[PDB]
Structure 1
Amino acid sequence: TTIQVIGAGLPRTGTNSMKKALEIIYSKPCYHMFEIIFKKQSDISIWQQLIDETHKTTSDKRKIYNGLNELLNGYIATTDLPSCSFYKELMTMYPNAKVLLTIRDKYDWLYSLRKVVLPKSTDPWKLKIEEGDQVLGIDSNFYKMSEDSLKFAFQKNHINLDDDEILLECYDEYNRLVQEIVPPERLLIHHLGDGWESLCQFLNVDIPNGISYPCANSHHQMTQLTEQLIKHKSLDDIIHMFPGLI
């Protein structure tokens, strides 16, 4: 099994739903941030090494190609951070892989990002996220890798992550750049709510009969999850409250 589909869309653009969508179409695993968090946290350090490699004056691109290949082995596809930030490299490694850009209203995206992935440094909620994630064994290593992958995406060394205006403009710039770099035939722009049709057409498959297009990982669902991890201090004790999430 090798990479058939590259997810270039940013966090909070429906990437988990897209992961579950492709897992239905291909009947093979798709990589995602949640793969790291819930199954393979050992991958965090690997991604960090690759991200840090990009910041060198002369980056070892074969080091990155090889590391990407080891991480994504046995996966048919990948979405969300940190793999989205490497969509250029992935396209090179897998010249036949198609590219998906999941996208949405820029204002709804920033709000989602703030609530789940990248709170302002002075937001009390940020402390709650960290507290809840500690139950999962997630700490500063994940947050740094996560933030670093996002800055690599936005191609910024020094950037003020607490400035909403910068984030909003980076978002537009990132999405524009994807469309510019990826040949049209090799790219599908999938807006939230688009469902099965364009995706299945683009991958030359039938629409999966009797199965609804996944709708997972809402920020309301994420807030509840953080709150329940704090309250019960155990994932397994509470997982039955979050079907279809992992």
Structure 2
Amino acid sequence: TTIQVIGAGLPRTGTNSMKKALEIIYSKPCYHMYEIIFKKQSDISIWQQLIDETHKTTSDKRKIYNGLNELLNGYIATTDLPSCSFYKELMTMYPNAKVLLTIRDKYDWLYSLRKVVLPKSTDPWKLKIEEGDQVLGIDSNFYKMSEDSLKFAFQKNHINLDDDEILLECYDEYNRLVQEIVPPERLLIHHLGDGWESLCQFLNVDIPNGISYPCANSHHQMTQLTEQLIKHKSLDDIIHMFPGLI
């Protein structure tokens, strides 16, 4: 098993649905931030080391390739942060892998991002998200790795993450840069709602018969997840309320 598809889309662009769609197509696992959170929190420090490497005057690209290869062993595809920030390195490692860019309206994206993964520091909802996440074992080391991967994707050392104007411009620039860097023949831009047809044609497979394209990980469900984690203090006690997520 080797990487066949590199997902370059940012969080809140349908990455979890795309992860599930690729798992349906290939019958093998796809990487996602939820793999780290729910299955392999030991990966956090490894990702942090690779992101740290990118800051050096000369990044040891072979150290990065080797670390990515180890992290992705057993997976057929990648989506989401932190992996999407390494899409160029993955393209070099896997010259036959195709690239997907999941994308959506930038204002819809910003609202989703602020509600679920990156609230403003002045938003009281941030404390609720953090309290729920603590139930999952998430701590400051996870948030540092995730923020660092986002800053790496946006190519910035210093960025005011609390400024919506900055985030909107970074989102547009990131998506533009993917389209400039990946040759069009190697890239599929998949807009929220596009479903199976373009994806299956791009990957040389048939449309899965009787299986609908996934629609996972809505902000409504995520807000409920935070609320129920806070209320019950146990993932296992609430997982029956959240089918089709992990």
TM-score range, shorter chain: over 0.9
1:1-246 pair list within 5 angstroms:
1-246=1-246
C-alpha separation in 1, matches of 2:146 and 2:112: 15
Q: CA shift at 1:66, angstroms?
A: 0.3
Q: CA shift at 1:164, angstroms?
A: 0.3
Gaps in structure 1 of 5+ consecutive residues? none
Q: CA shift at 1:137, angstroms?
A: 0.2
Instruction: Indicate the SS of the match to 1:224.
Output: helix
Q: Deviations over 1:121-154 (max 9, x none)?
A: 1110100011001000001111111100000000
Q: CA shift at 1:96, angstroms?
A: 0.3
Q: What's the TM-score, normalizing by structure 1?
A: 0.99
Q: CA shift at 1:243, angstroms?
A: 0.4
Q: CA shift at 1:108, angstroms?
A: 0.4
C-alpha separation in 2, matches of 1:218 and 1:85: 22
Q: CA shift at 1:11, angstroms?
A: 0.5
C-alpha separation in 1, matches of 2:23 and 2:70: 20
Q: CA shift at 1:115, angstroms?
A: 0.7
C-alpha separation in 2, matches of 1:193 and 1:139: 33
C-alpha separation in 2, matches of 1:51 and 1:109: 24
Instruction: Indicate the SS of the match to 1:189.
Output: strand
Moved over 6 A (4+): none
C-alpha separation in 2, matches of 1:6 and 1:38: 21
Q: CA shift at 1:58, angstroms?
A: 1.1
C-alpha separation in 2, matches of 1:230 and 1:118: 18
Instruction: Indicate the SS of the match to 1:205.
Output: coil
Q: Deviations over 1:150-182 (max 9, x none)?
A: 000000011110000000000000000000000
C-alpha separation in 2, matches of 1:54 and 1:99: 21
Gaps in structure 2 of 5+ consecutive residues? none
Instruction: Indicate the SS of the match to 1:236.
Output: coil
Aligned residues: 246
Q: CA shift at 1:57, angstroms?
A: 1.1
C-alpha separation in 2, matches of 1:89 and 1:14: 22
C-alpha separation in 2, matches of 1:158 and 1:21: 35
Q: Deviations over 1:34-73 (max 9, x none)?
A: 0000000000000000001101111111110000000000
Q: CA shift at 1:21, angstroms?
A: 0.0
C-alpha separation in 2, matches of 1:117 and 1:49: 22
Q: CA shift at 1:81, angstroms?
A: 0.3
C-alpha separation in 1, matches of 2:163 and 2:135: 29
Q: Deviations over 1:82-111 (max 9, x none)?
A: 000000000000000000000000000011
C-alpha separation in 2, matches of 1:94 and 1:118: 31
Instruction: Indicate the SS of the match to 1:237.
Output: coil
C-alpha separation in 2, matches of 1:218 and 1:52: 31
C-alpha separation in 2, matches of 1:141 and 1:209: 42
